[PDB]
Amino acid sequence: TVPPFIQPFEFPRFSIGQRVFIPCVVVSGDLPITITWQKDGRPIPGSLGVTIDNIDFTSSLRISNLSLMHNGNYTCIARNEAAAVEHQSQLIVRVPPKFVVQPRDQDGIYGKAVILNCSAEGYPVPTIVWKFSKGAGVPQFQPIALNGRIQVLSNGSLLIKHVVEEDSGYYLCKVSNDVGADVSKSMYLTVKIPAMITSYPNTTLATQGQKKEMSCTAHGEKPIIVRWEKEDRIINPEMARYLVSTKEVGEEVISTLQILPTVREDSGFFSCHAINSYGEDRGIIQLTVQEE
Ligand SMILES: *[C@@H]1O[C@H](CO)[C@@H](O[C@@H]2O[C@H](CO)[C@H](O)[C@H](O[C@]3(C(=O)O)C[C@H](O)[C@@H](NC(C)=O)[C@H]([C@H](O)[C@H](O)CO)O3)[C@H]2O)[C@H](O)[C@H]1NC(C)=O
Ligand SMILES: *[C@@H]1O[C@H](CO)[C@@H](O[C@@H]2O[C@H](CO)[C@H](O)[C@H](O)[C@H]2O)[C@H](O)[C@H]1NC(C)=O
Ligand SMILES: *[C@@H]1O[C@H](CO)[C@@H](O[C@@H]2O[C@H](CO)[C@H](O)[C@H](O)[C@H]2O)[C@H](O)[C@H]1NC(C)=O
Ligand SMILES: *[C@@H]1O[C@H](CO)[C@@H](O)[C@H](O)[C@H]1NC(C)=O
Ligand SMILES: [Ca+2]
């Protein structure tokens, strides 16, 4: 005879981690009345930690610790012998964009890919914006030039496809959604330089009986070793008329092979080889020796 009627309910605005109790109250209708709940048109999964209290003409959702997994549309269904009725509401809980875990200092290797990590929490999923202060001075943060080589990824991590020395510096990460904004602490990106031979004469001429010096300039992370070779034999110190010497000029190493005196047989290909933990390189110098 008298059908059930549910007292209209609407979920208030909630904060993450609060306690929630929401009753479905069947204020009229002949007994007995069966009251059940759905979430998003399905039974509430036991995984969700929602308690259901069925007390006479009521059924209540009880949640000890509100989390993002509780977001969704909840339906109360009240059925007796005469009729079944439904009432529904949307549970919305929003999370302010929070930096709980900051970005870490990282090493990038010149010429290779680096990802700068920046997961912040927030719902709605926050929009992520990166800033950059070139080099290790007092930071002055500027927008970043996105141009294929530098991209922001879906998870909000910064991709540098081919690191150059100019990428070395402070990076930070700003997050906003409707609820708020946050600005990460900066991290420092160090660009590691594989050993490079940057400069040498391609071909050079000596005179029999005279001193000849040939130099190579190397760059890269220290320690860096420069060795010389003549037609795949290593020029060892014990070699009588050859002297290898090194000097530091700024961040560069200048290696000099001195021959004293030069003989006709010194002519041919010399190589200077630089190695550090990150890489190696070589230069080739053709020596010709003219007559006295
Ligand atoms: C005579 O020797 C010179 C060196 O004294 C040779 O020059 C080299 O020529 C190369 C191609 O022919 C490259 O152009 C190289 O220049 C760069 C490069 O490889 O692009 C410039 C880059 O900016 C530099 N990268 C840095 C500094 O980070 C890169 C780097 O130093 C390499 O590791 C060098 O080993 O060099 C240029 O130096 C001439 O080709 C040679 N000529 C002849 C006739 O033999
Ligand atoms: C829960 O109910 C919402 C409506 O009250 C629903 O949101 C609407 O869905 C529309 C697409 O069908 C569009 O997204 C509108 O912008 C939005 O208001 C929401 O999608 C439902 N949530 C579920 C099923 O999880
Ligand atoms: C953010 O997004 C990146 C997804 O591309 C992820 O990194 C990748 O991991 C891949 C695994 O093989 C491979 O290493 C790619 O080179 C690298 O791009 C990155 O770790 C994600 N960040 C977090 C915090 O999860
Ligand atoms: C970046 O995130 C990935 C994926 O979880 C992680 O494994 C990697 O080592 C991170 N790098 C950091 C935090 O320096
Ligand atoms: Ca329905």
Numbering used by the authors: 594 to 885
What does the paper say about this structure?
Here, we present the use of the GlycoDelete (GD) HEK cell line for protein crystallization, which produces homogeneous mature-like trisaccharide glycan stubs. The GD cell line is derived from the HEK293S MGAT1−/− cell line and has been transformed with Golgi-resident EndoT (an endo-β-N-acetyl­glucosaminidase similar to EndoH). This enzyme processes the Man5GlcNAc2 glycans, allowing the NG to be further processed by native Golgi-resident enzymes to generate mature-like glycans consisting of one GlcNac (which can be fucosylated), one galactose (Gal) and one sialic acid (Neu5Ac). The glycan stubs do not need further enzymatic processing, and we show that for heavily glycosylated fragments of human colony-stimulating factor 1 receptor (CSF-1R), murine IL-12B and human Down syndrome cell-adhesion molecule (DSCAM) the NG modifications facilitate the production of diffraction-quality crystals.
Down syndrome cell-adhesion molecule (DSCAM) is a cell-surface glycoprotein with an extensive ectodomain consisting of ten immunoglobulin domains and six fibronectin domains. To further characterize the portion of the ectodomain of human DSCAM that interacts with netrin, we produced a truncated fragment consisting of immunoglobulin domains Ig7, Ig8 and Ig9. Wild-type-derived rod-shaped crystals were obtained of significant size and good morphology, but X-ray diffraction screening on the microfocus beamline P14 only resulted in diffraction patterns to ∼8 Å resolution. GD-derived crystals from the initial condition diffracted to 2.5 Å resolution and further optimization of the conditions resulted in a complete data set from a single crystal at 1.85 Å resolution. The crystal structure of human DSCAMIg7–Ig9 contains one molecule in the asymmetric unit. The fragment corresponds to three immunoglobulin (Ig)-type C2 domains, each consisting of two layers of antiparallel β-sheets held together by a conserved disulfide bond. Clear electron density for the glycan chains was observed in all three Ig domains at residues Asn666, Asn710, Asn748 and Asn795. The predicted glycan at Asn658 was not observed in the electron density. An analysis of the buried surface areas of all of the contacts occurring in the crystal lattice reveals that the most extensive protein interface is formed between Ig7 and a symmetry-related Ig7 domain (830 Å2). When this protein interface is compared with the Ig7–Ig7 interface observed in available Drosophila DSCAM crystal structures, it is remarkably similar. We conclude therefore that the rigidity of the glycan stub substantially contributes to crystal formation, but without disrupting the biologically relevant dimerization of the receptor fragment.
